[PDB]
């Protein structure tokens, strides 16, 4: 409830139509935010949220020259290093695959190379939820080994609650529509 109560009050007092934009836009983050603690915590994985790939490759390899390679400033959601491969974790809530076909060539171009000329195993990994069946696709052949089955129990009712109150509150305003 906290953070459903925050939303609650926001939209309870926005007047407009542009800080309706900020709260859906909010609301939307928490829901990928709340998706990806429910993958952690079913996978009993460490929980983050953006981290700089500078620290990634720190963390799985302390002693990398780094100075020697331009490293490019991405933050994907999360990582996990095996002691053999680092799979760099990326969580999607959305019904369809777009999203997630823009951020794996965006990682695929921008992660790999570094990571291959550093010399780490590395595979880009997207799970997504649907979050109106609840069902999990994951690209990644590796990430598909280690986590055959996934078993989280989702549950985004609250969240599409928050958003149609907003969408019934300003559904005759230009302005706020146009910002979808």
Same mark, same amino acid.
């Given at each position: 409830?906290?953070?459903?109560?925050?939303? !609650?009050?926001? %939209?309870?007092? /926005?007047?407009?139509?542009? &800080? *309706?934009?900020?709260?859906?836009?909010?609301?939307?983050? *928490?829901?990928?935010?709340?998706?990806?603690?429910?993958?952690?915590?079913? !996978?009993? @994985?460490?929980?983050?949220?953006? &981290? $700089?790939?500078?620290?990634? +490759?720190?963390? &799985?390899?302390?002693?990398?020259? $780094?100075?020697?390679?331009?490293?490019?400033?991405?933050?994907?959601?999360?990582? +996990?290093?095996?002691?053999?491969? $680092?799979? @760099? #974790?990326?969580?999607? /809530?959305?019904? =369809?695959?777009?999203?997630?076909?823009?951020?794996?060539?965006?990682?695929?171009? #921008? %992660? !790999?190379?570094?990571?291959?000329? %550093? =010399?780490?195993?590395?595979?880009?990994?997207?799970?997504?939820?649907?979050?109106?069946?609840?069902? @999990?696709?994951?690209?990644?052949?590796?990430?598909?080994? $280690?986590?055959?089955? @996934?078993? /989280?129990?989702?549950?985004? *009712?609250?969240?599409?609650? #928050?958003?149609?109150? !907003?969408?019934?509150?300003?559904?005759?305003?230009?302005?706020?529509?146009?910002?979808?």
């Amino acid at each position: 409830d906290p953070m459903y109560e925050q939303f !609650l009050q926001r %939209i309870q007092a /926005v007047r407009t139509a542009t &800080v *309706a934009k900020d709260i859906s836009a909010d609301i939307l983050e *928490a829901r990928h935010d709340y998706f990806g603690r429910e993958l952690c915590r079913a !996978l009993d @994985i460490e929980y983050r949220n953006n &981290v $700089l790939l500078d620290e990634i +490759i720190l963390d &799985v390899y302390p002693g990398v020259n $780094l100075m020697e390679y331009n490293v490019p400033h991405v933050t994907p959601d999360n990582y +996990i290093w095996t002691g053999d491969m $680092l799979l @760099i #974790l990326d969580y999607k /809530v959305s019904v =369809g695959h777009d999203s997630t076909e823009v951020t794996y060539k965006k990682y695929t171009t #921008l %992660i !790999l190379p570094v990571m291959q000329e %550093i =010399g780490i195993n590395t595979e880009i990994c997207i799970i997504r939820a649907n979050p109106v069946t609840n069902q @999990i696709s994951i690209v990644g052949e590796q990430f598909k080994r $280690l986590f055959p089955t @996934i078993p /989280v129990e989702l549950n985004f *009712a609250r969240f599409f609650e #928050l958003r149609k109150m !907003l969408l019934d509150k300003f559904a005759d305003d230009e302005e706020f529509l146009m910002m979808i």
